[PDB]
Enzyme design. Structure first.
Site, PDB file in Angstrom:
ATOM      1  N   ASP A   1       0.843  -1.196   0.000  1.00 42.75           N
ATOM      2  CA  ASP A   1       0.000   0.000   0.000  1.00 42.75           C
ATOM      3  C   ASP A   1       0.879   1.247   0.000  1.00 42.75           C
ATOM      4  O   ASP A   1       1.381   1.662   1.055  1.00 42.75           O
ATOM      5  CB  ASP A   1      -0.870  -0.007   1.245  1.00 42.75           C
ATOM      6  CG  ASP A   1      -1.783   1.193   1.325  1.00 42.75           C
ATOM      7  OD1 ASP A   1      -1.895   1.897   0.307  1.00 42.75           O
ATOM      8  OD2 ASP A   1      -2.378   1.397   2.404  1.00 42.75           O
TER       9      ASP A   1
ATOM     10  N   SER B   1      -0.517  15.694 -11.945  1.00 43.95           N
ATOM     11  CA  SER B   1      -0.782  15.345 -13.328  1.00 43.95           C
ATOM     12  C   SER B   1      -1.017  16.616 -14.143  1.00 43.95           C
ATOM     13  O   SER B   1      -1.535  17.615 -13.650  1.00 43.95           O
ATOM     14  CB  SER B   1      -1.976  14.386 -13.399  1.00 43.95           C
ATOM     15  OG  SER B   1      -2.406  14.160 -14.729  1.00 43.95           O
TER      16      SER B   1
END
Ligand SMILES: CCN(CCC(=O)O)C(=O)c1cccs1
Length: 330
Positions: free
Chosen positions: A35, A199
């Site tokens: 994770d 992004s």
């Protein structure tokens, strides 16, 4: 040193991925959920409340000659999905794919919430976010990657998650045969303890690319892609019959639809998520209402590039002094 381990989807939807991890001496192999959005290595154990164990493999520290109680240390964690676990702490030897760390903090669960009990395929979590998020008190502990870093050939790990197929986690090296083209690298902020990056934009299907900054985290422990409501609305508007439902909990669409792809920007590069990766199948068995793999982050507080996005790429988690993320197509 290096390590390399296969990671396998837990079910036919790729809801999560498990990776075998050797703990203790002799080894006890547990299948852990790696994770990158958390920083505790915790396991079901011989200390876990018996009614809260349902088919998981447990770690029994008393059977490990290298286990040592970390005196006074406790841990307690709550995840973004509302699940939680807590317990005490041992140090022990932990190996992943041939890479061994001695003295790793292994957090033994005394209590786990129902979602963990109900998932018999996940024996615990191995956190790979930054160690500043580790919950051990009163002395915070380091992640497996942080402990291994100095020994690694290069201070990196890579996630290569499969679509409906096994994939690979590598430590200490970049497998140049595992991706196509080049890798485009992007700056990371560690201010929140996550692999947080920006992004450069998105496209829906064959549509034009929209240049817009989207800050979010690379999180292998989250199934879906959570993005701003504007972006998610633009995606689902291209799927006839798709709609958001509060009572179901997100965007649903007809199981008869063909989904468009979704592209996200990494610098000047582009990662394309195929439409089929966005189908999480019927909401309930036999239903013709399919649950979408792109959902709004509006109620989370952060955008999350979960498995839906990451499995479309070969992803480099570069833990050098100035960390970076790398994405390549594959
Ligand atoms: C000059 C663009 N560039 C490199 C991208 C590439 O890997 O090609 C960057 O700005 C950065 C990469 C990592 C931190 S900043």
């Amino acid at each position: 040193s290096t390590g390399s381990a296969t990671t396998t989807p837990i079910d036919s939807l790729d809801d999560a991925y498990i990776t075998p991890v050797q703990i203790g001496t002799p080894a006890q192999t547990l299948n852990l959920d790696f994770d990158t959005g958390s920083s505790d290595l915790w396991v079901f154990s011989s200390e876990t409340t018996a009614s809260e164990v349902d088919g998981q493999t447990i770690y029994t520290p008393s059977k490990s000659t290298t286990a040592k109680l970390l005196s006074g240390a406790t841990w307690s964690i709550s995840y973004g999905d509302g699940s939680s676990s807590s317990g005490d702490v041992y140090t022990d030897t932990v190996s992943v794919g041939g890479l061994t760390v001695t003295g790793q903090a292994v957090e033994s669960a005394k209590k786990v919430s129902s979602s963990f009990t109900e998932d018999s395929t996940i024996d615990g979590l191995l956190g790979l976010a930054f160690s500043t998020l580790n919950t051990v008190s009163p002395t915070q502990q380091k992640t497996f990657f942080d402990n291994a870093k100095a020994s690694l050939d290069s201070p990196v790990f890579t996630a290569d998650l499969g679509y409906h197929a096994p994939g690979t986690y590598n430590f200490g090296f970049i497998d140049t045969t595992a991706y196509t083209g080049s890798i485009t690298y992007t700056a990371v902020s560690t201010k929140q303890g996550f692999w947080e990056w920006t992004s450069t934009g998105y496209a829906v299907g064959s549509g034009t690319f929209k240049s817009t900054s989207i800050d979010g985290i690379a999180d292998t422990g989250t199934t879906l892609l959570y993005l701003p409501a504007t972006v998610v609305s633009a995606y689902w508007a291209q799927v006839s019959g798709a709609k958001s439902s509060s009572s179901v909990g997100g965007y649903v669409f007809p199981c008869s639809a063909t989904l468009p792809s979704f592209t996200f920007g990494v610098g000047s590069a582009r990662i394309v998520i195929p439409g089929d990766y966005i189908d999480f199948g019927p909401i309930s068995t036999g239903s013709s209402s399919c649950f979408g793999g792109i959902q709004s982050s509006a109620g989370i507080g952060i955008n999350i590039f979960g498995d839906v996005a990451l499995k479309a790429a070969f992803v480099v988690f570069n833990g050098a002094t100035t960390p970076t993320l790398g994405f390549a197509s594959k």
